[PDB]
Design a protein around this ligand. Sequence first.
Ligand SMILES: Nc1nc2c(ncn2[C@@H]2O[C@H](COP(=O)(O)OP(=O)(O)O)[C@@H](O)[C@H]2O)c(=O)[nH]1
Length: 598
Amino acid sequence: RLRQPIVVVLGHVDHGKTTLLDKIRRTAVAAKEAGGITQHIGASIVPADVIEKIAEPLKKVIPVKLVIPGLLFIDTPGHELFSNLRRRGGSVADFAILVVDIMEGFKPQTYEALELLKERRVPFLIAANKIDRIPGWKPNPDAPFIETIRRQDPKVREILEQRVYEIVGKMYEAGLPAELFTRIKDFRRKIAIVPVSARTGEGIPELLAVLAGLTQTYLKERLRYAEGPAKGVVLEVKEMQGFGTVVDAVIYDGVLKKEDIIVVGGREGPIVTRVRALLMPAPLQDIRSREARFVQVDRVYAAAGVRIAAPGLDDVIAGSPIYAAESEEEARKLMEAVQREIEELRFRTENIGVVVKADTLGTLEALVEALRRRGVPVRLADIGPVSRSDVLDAAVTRKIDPYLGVVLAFNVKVLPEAEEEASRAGVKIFRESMIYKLIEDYEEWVKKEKEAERLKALNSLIRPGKFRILPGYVFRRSDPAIVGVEVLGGVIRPGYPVMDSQGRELGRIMAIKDRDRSLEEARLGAAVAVSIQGRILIGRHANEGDILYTNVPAQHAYKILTEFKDLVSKDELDVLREIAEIKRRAADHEYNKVLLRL
Ligand SMILES: Nc1nc2c(ncn2[C@@H]2O[C@H](COP(=O)(O)OP(=O)(O)O)[C@@H](O)[C@H]2O)c(=O)[nH]1
């Protein structure tokens, strides 16, 4: 027999994940029928008969005969939750809905979702949400998409088609063929796009029918229920009045019972305890449920969202496995299974790599997997605040490869000891609370650090520079000449030889100064005071308003154009072209040879 597919909801903030979950629940509850729907902790069921009923208006186009008993929707949406809905080597979710706001299209978290989905090989569909916000939309509440779209004005349907294509485009670009669900023949070959309104209920019938069809067709083996002790995962650890520290878990195989011995992953190792109570929300029909109310149950079966009361759960961490054990002997075996699972996620090595700290097992796993996907070695991965030890581990890495010698801290504090050491060691600590942002911030830094290293090689050379002596800013006429200039292109640095617009040598830059400070460099648009050491006498060899150039050696011009061409500014290249031409007209020997060479 089959059990319920477990469905998770992803997508960018405010694209409507929460509204969509709530609308699905309400629609199910309204569609039921006679007796209420079985209530779960952190999750809502849509039974088989309710889906078939909701699907009835589709009878002609998309029929639905169900062999799954229903769908379990996880009621906490988003990507941290999804990452904590985990088991060894994969997800506990069986299907995802990726919500995209049809009016906005893909946003940064939409790409995060796609990565998380391929990484853990979770199948999905796209819910193109907020269709009711299309200008001129005339809602038909709760109606199938296929019916309401035919009751819109031609311009409204045009916009919808345009906005769906925006999604289609991004998907093909990402390597994932996707189409409006109506146009798909082979649902193995193409991801379904279902336009919906979490607000009006439009398209909810096809959403559910497509979910049901895709899960029952392709996931039969994964969905098979085997009788035996519970396997599950902990999503949340918290206080509950009258029960102490409880865990909220999803059971994905077997049966969990009151009095069962459980083994659950904790900060200090596998915890062995015994279930005192299994809590579920009270039935909604019950008159005492106006009060937010819980009832104890004897048992729950996969798939279930359940709250577990048992002593000693304080040290549990989100994303930990939880197993029922039939005997002490079985619990001892399960302790080793748990510890081996936890060691894959929390580890330390002598490898040259980044230091990863996070707050839950799920996000720690997803962070490590994202780095691995990109080829970034990971020295250690663990739970909790960034400590002095973490910084010193990244310092070991830093000495070998500075681009890897960092701490990536996901939603954890950094201790003052660690702040102090990072400063002394030159180790950067990255702090963020969204995974893609942590990763992007690190990658961006790496790009800029690598660019800085190339620029060192370029600054071995006298670079192209062009600047005008400002009328009214001659501070000193000679020995050294000191003049206000505007940089018209390229760059000037202390030590650069300079020449006039005819290529005659005037001297060399002794100093470049702001109104505030001495500068190592000045670039396009800078107005600075340049001290020039040499024979230069202002009024004689150059005048106010005259344009001066750096005297780039021929060999240096060659290397800029053949090794650093992509790195210098367009304006820097413009100036080198001016310089090469000044040199050409002067009949400069070495420039003539380098230009022929080029
Ligand atoms: N007009 C319209 N608004 C929506 C729809 N779905 C969500 N919203 C609104 O968009 C906002 C964000 O929704 P929410 O479910 O919190 O997005 P989440 O951050 O992805 O969980 C809220 O104001 C919702 O009422 C929809 O289909 N149509």
